[PDB]
Amino acid sequence: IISTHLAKLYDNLLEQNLIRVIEPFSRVQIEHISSLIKLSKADVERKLSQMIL
Amino acid sequence: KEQNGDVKEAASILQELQVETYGSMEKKERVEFILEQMRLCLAVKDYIRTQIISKKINTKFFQEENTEKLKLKYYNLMIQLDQHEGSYLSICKHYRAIYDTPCIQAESEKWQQALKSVVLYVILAPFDNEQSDLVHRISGDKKLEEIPKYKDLLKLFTTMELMRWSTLVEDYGMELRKGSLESPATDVFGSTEEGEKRWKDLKNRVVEHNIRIMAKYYTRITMKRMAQLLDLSVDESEAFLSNLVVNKTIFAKVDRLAGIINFQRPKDPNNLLNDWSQKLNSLMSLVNKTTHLIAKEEMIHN
Amino acid sequence: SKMNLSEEVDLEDYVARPDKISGADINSICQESGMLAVRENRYIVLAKDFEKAYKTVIKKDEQEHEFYK
Amino acid sequence: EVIELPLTNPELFQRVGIIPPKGCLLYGPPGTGKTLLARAVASQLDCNF
Amino acid sequence: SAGFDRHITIFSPEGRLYQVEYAFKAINQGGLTSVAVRGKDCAVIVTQKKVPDKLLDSSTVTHLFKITENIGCVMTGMTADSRSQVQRARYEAANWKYKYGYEIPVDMLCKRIADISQVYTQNAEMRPLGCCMILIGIDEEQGPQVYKCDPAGYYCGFKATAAGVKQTESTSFLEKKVKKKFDWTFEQTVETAITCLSTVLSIDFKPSEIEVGVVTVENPKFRILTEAEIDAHLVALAE
Ligand SMILES: Nc1ncnc2c1ncn2[C@@H]1O[C@H](COP(=O)(O)OP(=O)(O)O)[C@@H](O)[C@H]1O
């Protein structure tokens, strides 16, 4: 229960943070957004792809 | 108790008193007790209790005969409270009230300090319709001339052109922070901790005004030029612009890849054709008006 | 949730009490505790005020004339 | 103590959370000055009354 | 609902006897207040002594009636019915002594009084006696005892109590006082009773407006404190 719910909370937090950090940008490069969120480039790329899809 | 250094105990003892309950005592003495309670609370650093006490004391009573000292002290205490909170516009309103006091008005130095602080706190206050109206009202004060640099700064913050932070500092740092015997510098921008915080806030206000000017005039300013004109590092300028955009203060689209800060809102085809139609209608109306004037001119010089 | 409340106030202390009180009684208890706090010129509600308000609200026998029970 | 605190500082009432202080009552002997109490307390505000 | 409050033997729709409650309320018609405080080794009761006429005889107005040398009573409420109940209580105590030897304990005495009142309330023949009967008296093996036992027929053991117009306020004051465990001494008991009465009535309590009666373990005989003793107790109370 804790694992699943905390994973869902982590997903929600990542979504909110990514949406917050892309509001000013219009063509932000992935490396800068990953650094802003303090996450691996691949993880942010995958999350952004899922969010768009 | 205060004379013995036990400020907390004195504040605790004086807070328990309910001056408003003492209806027998004269109104002036009640207001003095409220002011003393507010001063003790602010000394204890209980700003919430100070705010409650200040709300206890009315403002209409200050329109009386011998309430000059009471008004001065109450407005100084409220200035302290709102300075700790950080609301510069309320501080400016309080200093304007202080500057209106006849005792402050009569003496040259007192009103001069009040007006200097009012101009500085209008400058520091965030841009807004209310703040813009307050600046407009303060600017049209003939007495501002006696303080040249402060009125010059006030005008500079209303002119629609960029002011560079480096140039503004080189021009006004001596006159605004340190002062001179002929320039009685205020404590608003002093060297104390609050002084440095308010100096940084003034720099933030200057950069905000610069960004507003660019958004009004520019359409696509590179990040390098924006940073140069705002007197900030590229990353810091980008962060400030992003913070402004998130709050909805200004519209911008930071294209970090090419360093583009395009300001123009997207031009939907409907709006573009509407602008073209408005231009055509204005042209037609102006052509008719010029034809009417042309007929008049031909008529007169037969 | 809306009330300012305080750290030292543990609502679980009051919840477990065996007294049978309706939701209206709970709302009255909260309002009375807040108003007692405001009367003493305190903007923070503490345990003493909540306990006093709870004791006041729970009291509903009134007279009862002592023999009906 | 009943009509002054709510009027002067609604913020402290809203800060605590308890908004409504309404109610009140002056039960007692008939017409011993009941209206006057609502008049004497009308020293501040109580305009329409 | 309201049509069942004309006979004492008719039950109300919700299960109430309205006439008994009406008599309870009538208790207050006298406009007086009486309080009893049970000390560690003493029982003291103080009642208002109202004389709203210069021609009255203050010696004949006292509400503190001595049922027996060892048992005491203070009648609050209607004067005539209170005096009738006091006479009945004296008869009951005398009969108990004559039939069983040992003096009837206060609890038994006005338990008999309350049983009489209840038998009055059950069979609809007589209006219930609208007068609260507060009993005091030292009982061997049970220390001081004060029992209040009322028209409807309810008697209970009381550490402190009061009957009259200002009963709720006096009982609340006693509850605020009775809780801080302390030496319940004769002087302390009298002082607490007088203080409770003064605060409830909000009066300066001139010596001629109060009447006190105390029963103690050392002297287990009902004694009505004179003006001098009451004044001395009041002066001690003030300081
Ligand atoms: N304590 C008092 N102080 C001043 N006026 C009083 C007082 N008691 C009665 N009055 C007089 O009686 C009138 C008030 O009656 P009121 O109490 O308003 O009756 P009701 O309670 O039926 O409205 C006023 O005209 C007033 O002059």
**Structure solved using which method?**
cryo-EM
| B255:A27 CB<8 A | yes
List the 9-38 stretch of D: residues with Cβ below 8 A of B: 9, 11-12
| Domain E1-239 of CATH type 3.40.50.2300 | no
Q: How far is CA E183 from the centre of its chain?
A: 23
Most informative mutation of D25, D27, D32 for ligand 1 (most atoms within 8 A of CB): D32
Residues of chain C found within 8 Å of residue B48, distances taken between Cβ atoms: 43
Structure tokens at C61: 């026998």
Dihedral angle computed from the Cα positions of residues B45, B48, B52 and B58, in that order, rounded to the nearest 10 degrees = 70
Angle between helices B165-173 and B193-217 (to 10 degrees): 140
* Facing residue for B256 by CB, picked from A20, A23, A32: A32
**DSSP secondary structure of D1-49:** --SHHHHH-HHHHHHHS----------SSTTSSHHHHHHHGGGSS----
> Phi/psi of residue B264, each to 5°?
-65, 135
Cross-strand pairs, E147 = E135, E157
Treating both helix axes as pointing N-terminal to C-terminal, what angle do B88-100 and B68-85 enclose, rounded to 10 degrees? Answer: 170
Taking a C-beta distance cutoff of 8 angstroms, is the pair B115, B104 a contact? Answer: no
Cβ-proximal residues to B93 (8 Å cutoff; 6+ apart), any chain: B134
Residue E187 backbone phi and psi in degrees, to 5: -60, -45
Query: CB burial class (10 A; 0-12, 13-18, 19+) of residue B37?
Result: buried
Q: Give C2 to chain E, closest Cα distance, Å.
A: 34
Residue E150's alpha-carbon distances to E19, E79, E82, E153, in angstroms, are 14, 15, 11, 5
Contacts of E116 (CB under 8 A, 6+ apart): E88, E92
How far C59 CA lies from chain E's nearest CA (Å)?
13
Minimum Cα–Cα distance from C62: chain E residue: E168
Regarding the beta carbon of D31 and ligand 1, being less than 6 Å apart is answered yes
β-sheet bridge partners, residue E139 = E143
**Maximum alpha-carbon separation in chain D:** 39
- Atom 18 in ligand 1: residue holding the nearest Cα: D35
Given a contact cutoff of 8 angstroms between Cβ atoms, the answer to whether B17 and B29 are in contact is: no
The whole-angstrom separation of Cα A1 and Cα E191 is 67
